Design a protein around this motif. Structure first.
Motif, PDB file in Angstrom:
ATOM      1  N   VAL A  35       0.848  -1.184   0.000  1.00 41.23           N
ATOM      2  CA  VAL A  35       0.000   0.000   0.000  1.00 41.23           C
ATOM      3  C   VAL A  35       0.886   1.236   0.000  1.00 41.23           C
ATOM      4  O   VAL A  35       1.820   1.347   0.810  1.00 41.23           O
ATOM      5  N   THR A  36       0.570   2.160  -0.910  1.00 36.51           N
ATOM      6  CA  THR A  36       1.306   3.374  -1.211  1.00 36.51           C
ATOM      7  C   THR A  36       0.927   4.488  -0.237  1.00 36.51           C
ATOM      8  O   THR A  36       0.051   4.334   0.617  1.00 36.51           O
ATOM      9  N   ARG A  37       1.590   5.641  -0.384  1.00 39.61           N
ATOM     10  CA  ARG A  37       1.315   6.770   0.500  1.00 39.61           C
ATOM     11  C   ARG A  37      -0.104   7.303   0.335  1.00 39.61           C
ATOM     12  O   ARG A  37      -0.682   7.814   1.300  1.00 39.61           O
ATOM     13  N   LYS A  38      -0.684   7.192  -0.861  1.00 39.71           N
ATOM     14  CA  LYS A  38      -2.059   7.614  -1.101  1.00 39.71           C
ATOM     15  C   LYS A  38      -3.028   6.438  -1.077  1.00 39.71           C
ATOM     16  O   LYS A  38      -4.071   6.474  -1.740  1.00 39.71           O
ATOM     17  N   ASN A  39      -2.693   5.397  -0.312  1.00 39.21           N
ATOM     18  CA  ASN A  39      -3.595   4.279  -0.035  1.00 39.21           C
ATOM     19  C   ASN A  39      -4.062   3.617  -1.330  1.00 39.21           C
ATOM     20  O   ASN A  39      -5.240   3.302  -1.503  1.00 39.21           O
ATOM     21  N   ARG A  40      -3.127   3.415  -2.254  1.00 37.85           N
ATOM     22  CA  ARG A  40      -3.375   2.639  -3.459  1.00 37.85           C
ATOM     23  C   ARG A  40      -2.698   1.282  -3.320  1.00 37.85           C
ATOM     24  O   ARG A  40      -1.513   1.204  -2.977  1.00 37.85           O
ATOM     25  N   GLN A  41      -3.452   0.221  -3.584  1.00 37.50           N
ATOM     26  CA  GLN A  41      -2.987  -1.139  -3.357  1.00 37.50           C
ATOM     27  C   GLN A  41      -2.389  -1.737  -4.624  1.00 37.50           C
ATOM     28  O   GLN A  41      -2.925  -1.565  -5.722  1.00 37.50           O
ATOM     29  N   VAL A  42      -1.273  -2.444  -4.460  1.00 34.98           N
ATOM     30  CA  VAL A  42      -0.574  -3.084  -5.569  1.00 34.98           C
ATOM     31  C   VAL A  42      -0.187  -4.493  -5.140  1.00 34.98           C
ATOM     32  O   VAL A  42       0.240  -4.712  -4.001  1.00 34.98           O
ATOM     33  N   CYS A  43      -0.344  -5.450  -6.049  1.00 39.50           N
ATOM     34  CA  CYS A  43      -0.111  -6.854  -5.747  1.00 39.50           C
ATOM     35  C   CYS A  43       1.282  -7.290  -6.182  1.00 39.50           C
ATOM     36  O   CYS A  43       1.897  -6.694  -7.070  1.00 39.50           O
ATOM     37  N   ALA A  44       1.777  -8.352  -5.545  1.00 37.99           N
ATOM     38  CA  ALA A  44       3.098  -8.847  -5.893  1.00 37.99           C
ATOM     39  C   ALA A  44       3.225 -10.324  -5.540  1.00 37.99           C
ATOM     40  O   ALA A  44       2.525 -10.848  -4.660  1.00 37.99           O
ATOM     41  N   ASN A  45       4.202 -10.962  -6.194  1.00 40.26           N
ATOM     42  CA  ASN A  45       4.398 -12.408  -6.138  1.00 40.26           C
ATOM     43  C   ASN A  45       5.384 -12.758  -5.038  1.00 40.26           C
ATOM     44  O   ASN A  45       6.549 -12.353  -5.117  1.00 40.26           O
ATOM     45  N   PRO A  46       4.990 -13.549  -4.040  1.00 42.82           N
ATOM     46  CA  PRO A  46       5.915 -13.849  -2.936  1.00 42.82           C
ATOM     47  C   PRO A  46       7.149 -14.638  -3.344  1.00 42.82           C
ATOM     48  O   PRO A  46       8.203 -14.475  -2.716  1.00 42.82           O
ATOM     49  N   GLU A  47       7.061 -15.487  -4.372  1.00 43.68           N
ATOM     50  CA  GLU A  47       8.177 -16.375  -4.678  1.00 43.68           C
ATOM     51  C   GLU A  47       9.367 -15.653  -5.303  1.00 43.68           C
ATOM     52  O   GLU A  47      10.474 -16.200  -5.294  1.00 43.68           O
ATOM     53  N   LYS A  48       9.177 -14.450  -5.839  1.00 43.42           N
ATOM     54  CA  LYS A  48      10.287 -13.757  -6.475  1.00 43.42           C
ATOM     55  C   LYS A  48      11.122 -13.011  -5.436  1.00 43.42           C
ATOM     56  O   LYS A  48      10.652 -12.674  -4.348  1.00 43.42           O
ATOM     57  N   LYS A  49      12.376 -12.730  -5.806  1.00 47.03           N
ATOM     58  CA  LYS A  49      13.331 -12.180  -4.845  1.00 47.03           C
ATOM     59  C   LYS A  49      13.009 -10.735  -4.481  1.00 47.03           C
ATOM     60  O   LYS A  49      13.130 -10.346  -3.314  1.00 47.03           O
ATOM     61  N   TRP A  50      12.602  -9.924  -5.462  1.00 45.21           N
ATOM     62  CA  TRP A  50      12.379  -8.506  -5.196  1.00 45.21           C
ATOM     63  C   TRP A  50      11.263  -8.292  -4.181  1.00 45.21           C
ATOM     64  O   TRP A  50      11.299  -7.323  -3.413  1.00 45.21           O
ATOM     65  N   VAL A  51      10.302  -9.212  -4.117  1.00 43.40           N
ATOM     66  CA  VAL A  51       9.214  -9.074  -3.157  1.00 43.40           C
ATOM     67  C   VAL A  51       9.732  -9.266  -1.739  1.00 43.40           C
ATOM     68  O   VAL A  51       9.408  -8.489  -0.831  1.00 43.40           O
ATOM     69  N   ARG A  52      10.554 -10.297  -1.528  1.00 46.61           N
ATOM     70  CA  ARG A  52      11.156 -10.486  -0.214  1.00 46.61           C
ATOM     71  C   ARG A  52      12.090  -9.333   0.118  1.00 46.61           C
ATOM     72  O   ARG A  52      12.216  -8.952   1.287  1.00 46.61           O
ATOM     73  N   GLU A  53      12.748  -8.761  -0.896  1.00 41.63           N
ATOM     74  CA  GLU A  53      13.621  -7.616  -0.658  1.00 41.63           C
ATOM     75  C   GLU A  53      12.833  -6.417  -0.142  1.00 41.63           C
ATOM     76  O   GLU A  53      13.242  -5.767   0.828  1.00 41.63           O
ATOM     77  N   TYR A  54      11.683  -6.126  -0.759  1.00 41.95           N
ATOM     78  CA  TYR A  54      10.845  -5.034  -0.262  1.00 41.95           C
ATOM     79  C   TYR A  54      10.283  -5.352   1.117  1.00 41.95           C
ATOM     80  O   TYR A  54      10.201  -4.468   1.980  1.00 41.95           O
ATOM     81  N   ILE A  55       9.884  -6.607   1.340  1.00 40.73           N
ATOM     82  CA  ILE A  55       9.367  -7.012   2.646  1.00 40.73           C
ATOM     83  C   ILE A  55      10.408  -6.747   3.727  1.00 40.73           C
ATOM     84  O   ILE A  55      10.103  -6.189   4.788  1.00 40.73           O
ATOM     85  N   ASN A  56      11.657  -7.141   3.469  1.00 47.88           N
ATOM     86  CA  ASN A  56      12.717  -6.957   4.455  1.00 47.88           C
ATOM     87  C   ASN A  56      13.073  -5.485   4.623  1.00 47.88           C
ATOM     88  O   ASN A  56      13.373  -5.040   5.737  1.00 47.88           O
ATOM     89  N   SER A  57      13.043  -4.710   3.534  1.00 53.58           N
ATOM     90  CA  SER A  57      13.431  -3.306   3.622  1.00 53.58           C
ATOM     91  C   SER A  57      12.387  -2.473   4.356  1.00 53.58           C
ATOM     92  O   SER A  57      12.739  -1.504   5.039  1.00 53.58           O
ATOM     93  N   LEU A  58      11.108  -2.828   4.228  1.00 53.54           N
ATOM     94  CA  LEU A  58      10.058  -2.062   4.891  1.00 53.54           C
ATOM     95  C   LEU A  58      10.017  -2.333   6.390  1.00 53.54           C
ATOM     96  O   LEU A  58       9.665  -1.442   7.172  1.00 53.54           O
ATOM     97  N   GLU A  59      10.376  -3.547   6.810  1.00 50.80           N
ATOM     98  CA  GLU A  59      10.207  -3.964   8.197  1.00 50.80           C
ATOM     99  C   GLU A  59      11.282  -3.432   9.137  1.00 50.80           C
ATOM    100  O   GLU A  59      11.074  -3.449  10.355  1.00 50.80           O
ATOM    101  N   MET A  60      12.420  -2.976   8.625  1.00 49.17           N
ATOM    102  CA  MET A  60      13.488  -2.441   9.470  1.00 49.17           C
ATOM    103  C   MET A  60      13.388  -0.919   9.467  1.00 49.17           C
ATOM    104  O   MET A  60      13.851  -0.255   8.535  1.00 49.17           O
ATOM    105  N   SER A  61      12.782  -0.367  10.516  1.00 45.60           N
ATOM    106  CA  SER A  61      12.637   1.078  10.650  1.00 45.60           C
ATOM    107  C   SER A  61      13.194   1.563  11.985  1.00 45.60           C
ATOM    108  O   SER A  61      12.915   2.682  12.415  1.00 45.60           O
TER     109      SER A  61
END
Lengths: 63, 62, 64, 64, 64, 64, 62, 62, 63, 62, 64, 64, 63, 64, 63, 64, 62, 64, 64, 62
Positions: free
Chosen positions: F38-64
């Motif tokens: 979900v984006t800054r203006k609350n727009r939803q976008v889908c993604a595939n868990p099995e690909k590497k870039w999705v896990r990369e975004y998951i890991n990058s968002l969770e460390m704040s």
């Protein structure tokens, strides 16, 4: 050693069948008192000027 | 170093098979009471004026 | 501590004996007279003096 | 905190012992008597005293 | 809040461990017993107790 | 709100991370497990868990 | 954006005075269902095979 | 994610001046119920079969 | 986890300047009650049938 | 486990530099009272009817 | 025993420390405050608190 | 331990500070309110709250 | 503008008393489909290959 | 609305920014990924993701 | 100045003739030459002139 | 409606704006990009975006 | 009145079985062209310079 | 019919408005830009855009 | 028995140690400070603390 | 051996009906005193210079 004294007196008269010994507080004590000793060595103080104490004293010594 | 007393009295009579020793409360406290001590060194206070307490007092020395 | 602990609730099932290490009584000024058991790991448990298992545990613990 | 926690729901699968840190009992005024376990990270889980695994854990945890 | 959350859907792929912050169990009043993980950003996810990775994650988080 | 949102389509190009605000997983009852950002203006976008870039975004968002 | 679906059906019939609009689930959904939306624009699921659901469907369009 | 439900119902009706929104419990849970949310986002369970709950629902929706 | 309940009600009204939030006891509880939480996260029980409890309920949530 | 109560109220006000926390006795208690806990976890009871206790109540939460 | 011991006589020579087992004070309500030492075989001997040697014993007995 | 300790006698000479380990107050039901200090080896001593010496020790000890 | 398409087909046939209009998806679409519109402007996708869809198309186009 | 709109034709000249009100992406089920802008009068216009001006608009609209 | 309709996508299944009411050609300025059919309720459909199915419909509609 | 309208001819004289109610753009697959205005009586007219008056009409119509 | 014209010419030759009549664009037109009319009286434009247009003109007139 | 009407002749006398029912413009590919009026009996008559009576009729017909 | 015994005469030759069972000090109110030994046959005998043999007996009796 | 003496004198005169014998303190001690002995051989000390002591001394010996 230690020179024991007592500054608090019991209110109701103690049963006679338990009293084992009798003596006086030391002269160096602040308040003169009477010390009773139970058959199993429990000590309790009482006021000598009161009536019940003198009768117990005489009954213990007249035996 | 400290003179314990009791200002609250137990209601139901304590069993006799547990009582090991007994002594009296200090005179300078507000309420005179009797203190019993059990075989496992637990202290419980009671009112001398009631009958079972005086019976326990009398029973120990004979 | 200026606080006099008490108990207003009694347990239902008898507590196992292998854990009980100590016992004492509630104060006389308490609302409900009760017995307090203490386990080997310092757990507090309330009980009713009028019940039979309480008398059994009280008598069994004091016969050391 | 004058709140009396209780239990109206019991866990189904026995919890592993390597996680159990402490255990205690529900209050006597409770509707259902139950046992409450607390894990190493202070998560509480409820259980039924009448079952065998609960008394076995009580006996194993309270000794040493 | 008098609401009883539950779990009716289980994840398929093993969850990354670096995100789990806490863990707990579903209530006994629940239809299906399950385990609930919560990430650092307060997203709740359900998981299957019978699988190996769930028990391993529970034990590794609660021991270390 | 008794509807269980799901996702049946995966995006092709990786989304810029400076816009991602939150992320979560699809329900287990879904046909295809997927990740939803979900984006800054609350727009939803889908993604595939099995690909590497999705896990990369998951890991990058969770460390704040 | 997101393609909502439904995997759970309501039990008690919903009041008619509250229904404002209705639509259908997508074909790619696991379970085909009917979606009603109330005056406060919250969506609730229903079973197409039952009679009351189809009667509500017919009543909304007329 | 998590699918909330309700397994315990409140007894006295809650004051109306606080209710802000309402929605329904999921179908897959054991007991269908109604969930009210107050101005301070506090959730409370309720019985759909009761009269006062439907009256509150109707007052909020119309 | 644990499902809290309350079986005892306070007597004297609690000050309002300290109450931070409030909620109700669960329906599965034996006696329905109201629980207040203060600025320092101290929980206190109260009786719903009394006027001051519902008045506090109205004053905190309608502001 | 055990539900503490108080049957005795302190006379002189307690110093504030020592006060760490405070709470209330349970409602089923014989005497409603205020309980203070010091920096080293010493428990002290206090009388609700006097103002100094209310001053401590107001001072601790602000 | 309802007797409050005190001291009216003070010893002159300082007592050896290797024999002292415990130490305490006389009660406050007696006329003269004093110090009480107890030997390994439970013989008690009195001493004057204001004296210099007594303070050394006072500090030495309870510390390490 | 259904015993309510009290104190009716106050010490005269100031106590050394290096020995005090804990402190508490007498119960409210007591005849005379007093403060109780405890030594390094658990020797109990009574004191009068209204005097300066008691507040000096109390405030200096709690500053820990 | 935007060119709508249909990639998911409904399973059970829709009642005709609701259908008001119908049209076809564009040729550049991934999946050829039929689009029905109800009297209350609800959009629904449909399968051209099945009998009920073509029957509804013919019955609406001859009315 | 069970219809999935798409876009297969891209605009040539860049769109003025003073009119853009909202933005979204085509679905994953779409043949060609594209960007869709929505103006103040709710007119949608298509754009090519690989071009630079399109990439700039998302970031400029989404922040503040 | 006015609007010049065109066709850039061709339908896959041949349209039934019982629905076709009229037909015409795209303008010469159009990108792709195509045929436009109109149904009984005025639905427009695009078609490829070079393909076989279009020619029979064109010849049969005019007779 | 499977018809894609387009525009291949541009007007010569500046058009009055007071009749235009809405506006949109020609499709991307078209040969010539153009602007389409619609009057109060729903008549469509074409215009050239590169001139100033077309952008002036677009901005003035879309901002109020 | 209005003087019709033609600005776009068809690419593929039109079938002969449908043409019923034909005429010419006006001379004031930008590009002179030929206009054919189908059996269903719909007009279609064509380029005079091409061979098939001359063939249709001569075939209809003979 | 894919026929492109045009205008090469302008009327002399102003046309009465009480007969005009509709209005539109000539195509851009036309040699001469002109205005086209349509009568109640669906007869088209041409006129000069540059003249005042045509524009006044334009504005009065489009908003009435 | 409120009598304070004293001794004004000291023994000359050192006393055998194998007979001494207990020992104490003379009272502070005594004219001459002395040490008092008590034998197995309940005979009290005084000696001078200032001599070495007395301190040797005191030290040997209090430990062993 | 040990030579007992007296360093503390009683205040109120002791009743004579219990005293059976009496003796003197040694001369070598700091305070000369008289020691009375009761019927069951309990000793209490008294001041020789006072009148009541001499009254008992003279009355017992005659």
């Amino acid at each position: 050693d230690t020179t024991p004294c007592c500054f608090a007196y019991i209110a109701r008269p103690l049963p006679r069948a338990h009293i084992k010994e009798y003596f006086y507080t030391s002269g160096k004590c602040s308040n003169p008192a009477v010390v009773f000793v139970t058959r199993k060595n429990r000590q309790v103080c009482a006021n000598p000027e009161k009536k019940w104490v003198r009768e117990y004293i005489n009954s213990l010594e007249m035996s």
